[PDB]
Amino acid sequence: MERDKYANFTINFTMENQIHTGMEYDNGRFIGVKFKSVTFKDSVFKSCTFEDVTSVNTYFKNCTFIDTVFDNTDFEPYKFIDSEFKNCSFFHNKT
């Protein structure tokens, strides 16, 4: 009944048409990723880094982000629905 964990990874591929629920991502790097039609639900991101990311029709719903950085992403506030942040940072936003 814990969340399924995925840790110490680097994702650098196009992720599309998929829903991830009840996941815990720890020390994960999302670098050079395009998200299209992706939703993370009820998931936790600890010490993750999103870097150079674009997202279309992509959301984080009821997710918790801790010690997480969003660098050179297009993640605007509307992409986070009912979510929360603990000691996170956004910078170099796209456009």
Binding site: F85, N87, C88, S89, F91
Partner: protein
């Protein structure tokens, strides 16, 4: 007027007042290397300052008026352990009467307690949900006055903030000791910095409070964003006060490149605890000593300097060709040995022509001493290039409002907590 005036002397604290208060300092009290009057107290029982007042000046009265002033720097509160947790910091309460200063999330609190254990409090509140805060982790001047027939009043940076009637309070019999100590703070990493604690035997008036503020501000010395002395040979991130949503960038090195204001500036967040712009962005500036004959490392009003700009970990020189056409002179980052006779001397300003303290300005001059202009910015095809422009100086000379030539210098500080 003064009945206790604590200053730094010789790896120690002393009282300048006539009453010669005894001061016992614990193991783990620290003085800042640059300004030794800035005292750091940490969250340990050994980080204490105990001031023993002579009996003659112990507060014991229904009627005597009294005030206190001091400067304080309070780190940002980062997490839920900091919510809803009042902790005493300066304590003169004995047998449940006296006064104290305490803190809490976004608050500075003053408490009076009489000998029936009646209490009145005044509070300063500040938000952590602001892009750029005037208060979080910055030096703030606090003044609290008490008139036994009227009100307790709290001033912040000379400005009246909160006031409450205290004619409900009877005899207040405070302690003969003041204890400076974090007391009841559940965050093990919490600290404070304080400077220039004073006690006065009257209700200070507005003018007295403003003069204290102006006086103790050192307005001939430039300050960094945190309120510390601005320093030579120290990396600073630059904030343009008129457009705080950008940071400084350089498109290319050399006289065909230019410095400009790039956005958007980022943010740091903890849901419902803080939400602020990131401060550690852009090409850092390093102020280099040029004409000052002052042997210390502090930057003073009217110091003539050079500005080094850091671009990918290498230092270049901020300069322009004042012969370029137009009042606005676009600034470039040049190889330090290629500067030649380009204009690069900067006059650092902490105050205007009539001696009024104000935000940092940089007046670029040529090598004949002619002003080329305060450094601000101008839009060239939607790009906000840094310029020196004498229009700014003419506006300053007329007392007019300027826009974009006022800057803050931000060094990395452990009370702010962002990563660099």
């Amino acid at each position: 007027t003064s009945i206790l005036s604590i200053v730094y002397k010789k790896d120690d604290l002393i009282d300048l007042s006539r009453y010669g208060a005894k001061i016992n300092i614990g193991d783990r009290v620290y003085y800042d290397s640059i300004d030794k009057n800035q005292i750091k107290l940490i969250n340990l029982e050994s980080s204490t300052i105990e001031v023993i007042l002579k009996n003659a000046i112990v507060y014991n009265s229904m009627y005597e008026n009294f005030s206190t002033s001091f400067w304080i720097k309070i780190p940002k509160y980062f997490s839920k352990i900091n919510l809803n947790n009042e902790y005493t910091i300066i304590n003169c309460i004995e047998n449940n009467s006296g006064w104290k200063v305490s803190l809490n999330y976004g608050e500075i609190i003053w408490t009076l307690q009489d000998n029936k254990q009646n209490i009145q409090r005044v509070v300063f509140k500040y938000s952590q949900m602001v892009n750029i805060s005037d208060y979080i982790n910055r030096w703030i001047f606090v003044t609290i006055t008490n008139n036994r027939l009227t009100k307790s009043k709290i001033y912040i940076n000379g400005r009246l903030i909160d006031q409450k009637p205290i004619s409900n309070l009877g005899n207040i019999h405070a302690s003969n000791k003041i204890m400076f100590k974090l007391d009841g703070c559940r965050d093990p990493r919490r600290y404070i910095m304080i400077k220039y604690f004073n006690l006065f035997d009257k209700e200070l008036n507005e003018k007295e409070i403003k003069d204290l503020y102006d006086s103790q501000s050192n307005s001939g010395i430039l300050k960094d964003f945190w309120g510390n002395y601005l320093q030579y040979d120290k990396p600073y991130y630059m904030l343009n006060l008129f457009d705080p949503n950008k940071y400084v960038d350089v498109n290319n090195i050399g006289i065909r490149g230019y410095m400009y204001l790039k956005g958007p500036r980022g943010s740091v967040v903890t849901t419902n605890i803080y939400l602020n712009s990131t401060l550690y962005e852009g090409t850092k500036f390093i102020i280099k000593k040029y004409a000052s004959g002052n042997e210390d490392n502090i930057v003073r009003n009217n110091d003539r300097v050079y500005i080094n700009v850091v671009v990918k970990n290498k230092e270049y020189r901020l300069a322009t060709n004042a012969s370029q056409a137009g009042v606005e002179k676009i600034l470039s980052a040049l190889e330090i040995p290629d500067v030649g006779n380009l204009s690069q001397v900067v006059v650092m300003k902490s105050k205007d022509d009539q001696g009024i303290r104000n935000k940092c300005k940089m007046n670029l001059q040529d090598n004949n001493g002619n002003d080329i202009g305060f450094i601000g910015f101008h839009l060239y095809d939607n790009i906000a290039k840094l310029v020196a422009s004498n229009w700014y100086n003419r506006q300053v000379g007329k007392a007019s409002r300027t826009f974009g030539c006022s800057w803050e210098f931000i060094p990395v500080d452990d009370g702010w907590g962002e990563s660099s």
